[PDB]
Structures are given as C-alpha cells and as structure tokens.
Amino acid sequence: SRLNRESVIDAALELLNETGIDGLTTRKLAQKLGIEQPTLYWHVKNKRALLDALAVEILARHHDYSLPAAGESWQSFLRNNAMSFRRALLRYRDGAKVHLGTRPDEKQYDTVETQLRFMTENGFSLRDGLYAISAVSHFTLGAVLEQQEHTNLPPLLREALQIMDSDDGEQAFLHGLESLIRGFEVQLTALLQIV
C-alpha cells in the first residue's frame, strides 16, 4: 500500500496498539504494509527512527491544547495542557513509553517557546516558569506510565488499591494537578518574601 510518511505512521500507530512498544518491530511493520523489509528500510532506517517519529506524531495529531486561549489565566492553561498531554499519551498503547526519551521536534519548538514566554508574561522568571511546566510534564508522564503499565492486603492498602483501579487514573491525576498549580501560585505570589 502507500508508503508516504502519513501512511507509514498510520500503520505503525495501529501496530503499536496491537503489539505494544516491546513487540513493535520494523519486520512486522513491513508485514502490515504488504511490503518487503528492504523496501521499508528506504522509508525508515530502524526501530529508533520509527519511535522518534511516532512520539512526534502522537503530539501533533492528538495534543491540541498546546497553546493558551487569548486571555486565559496561566493556571487554566497548565490545566488544559496537562489534560491534553495526558489524553494524547493515553490514546495509544505504551504511548508514554513511546514519548519517553525524545525532546520536542523542530516542528513544535515555537510551541514550547510560546508556552515558556506566556509563563514569563505572567510573573514567572524563565527558570520558575520552566520548573512549573517541567513539573506538570513529569507528574503527567508518571501518572500515565503507571496507569498504562498497571494494565492478603492490609486494610488501608486494600482500600487504596480499590480507589486506584476504580477509574483510569483520572481522579487521582486531576486532584494532584490542582495541588501542583496552587503550589506554583503560592510560589509565584510570594515574590521575594519567605514562604
């Protein structure tokens, strides 16, 4: 079938859902494409090249709140952005694991640039602006990884693990998202006072 970038990524993302990250190979991507391995090699040099492209394409396709609404509070932007990132990570099997170990692609540099600028415009230094955004990203990544991977107890543990499996991680994630944002705001608001 067709072997333009878009077609190669469609098959590879569909295969990822079948196989996971561990069992995804170039040879079986060739299978799905109705093609021989050396044909595919022309288009994609190996598994590392492929995952890199899938990581970039998972953001472009499905992370659609990368940018603040005109007038949006910084708080609300980190909220919506966190939720979008999570959902984009959740849309494919092992998607957090696909995302792990890549930086933003050229194509989105200006988007991470705008995110960082937007924060500095709301009273953050570039550093504290970065730390808050990184924090959102690491909390969000960790919660999706744990969620996606979880796919004689003592009393409080038995009851805690019933509360963890009673959804897809959403409740726990959104509660701790609010703790993080308020924590940032408490930092922001104090300026140079001891807090």
Ligand X SMILES: CN(C)[C@@H]1C(O)=C(C(N)=O)C(=O)[C@@]2(O)C(=O)C[C@@H]([C@]3(C)OC(=O)c4c(O)ccc(Cl)c43)C[C@@H]12
Q: Does 163 bind a second copy (CB under 8 A)?
A: yes
Q: What HEC string does the chain produce?
A: CCCCHHHHHHHHHHHHHHHCCCCCCHHHHHHHCCCCHHHHHHHCCCHHHHHHHHHHHHHHHHCCCCCCCCCCCHHHHHHHHHHHHHHHHHCCCCHHHHHCCCCCCHHHHHHHHHHHHHHHCCCCCHHHHHHHHHHHHHHHHHHHHHHHHHCCCCHHHHHHHHHHCCCCCHHHHHHHHHHHHHHHHHHHHCCCCCC
Q: Which does 60 bind (CB under 5 to 8 A by kind): ligand X, Cl ion, a second copy, none?
A: none
Subset of 69-108 contacting a second copy (CB under 8 A): 100-101, 103-104, 106
Q: Is 81 assigned a ligand-binding role in the annotation?
A: yes
Q: Which of 4, 151, 152, 166 touches Cl ion (CB under 5 A)?
A: 4
Q: Rounded to an integer, what distance in angstroms lies between the CA atom of residue 151 and that of residue 168? A: 10
Is there a binding annotation on residue 138?
no
Q: How many residues bind a second copy (CB under 8 A)?
A: 56
Identified binder of ligand X from the candidate list 40, 44, 98, 136, rule CB under 6 A: 136
Segment contacting ligand X (CB under 6 A): 15-23, 37-45, 59-67, 120-128?
59-67
Q: Scanning residues 164 to 183, which ones bind a second copy (CB under 8 A)?
A: 164, 171-173, 175-176, 178-183
Stretch that binds ligand X, among 8-16, 44-52, 134-142, 174-182 (CB under 6 A): 134-142
Annotated binding-site positions:
63, 81, 99
Residues that bind ligand X (CB under 6 A): 59, 63, 66, 81, 85, 103-104, 108, 111-112, 115, 133-134, 136-137, 146, 161, 164
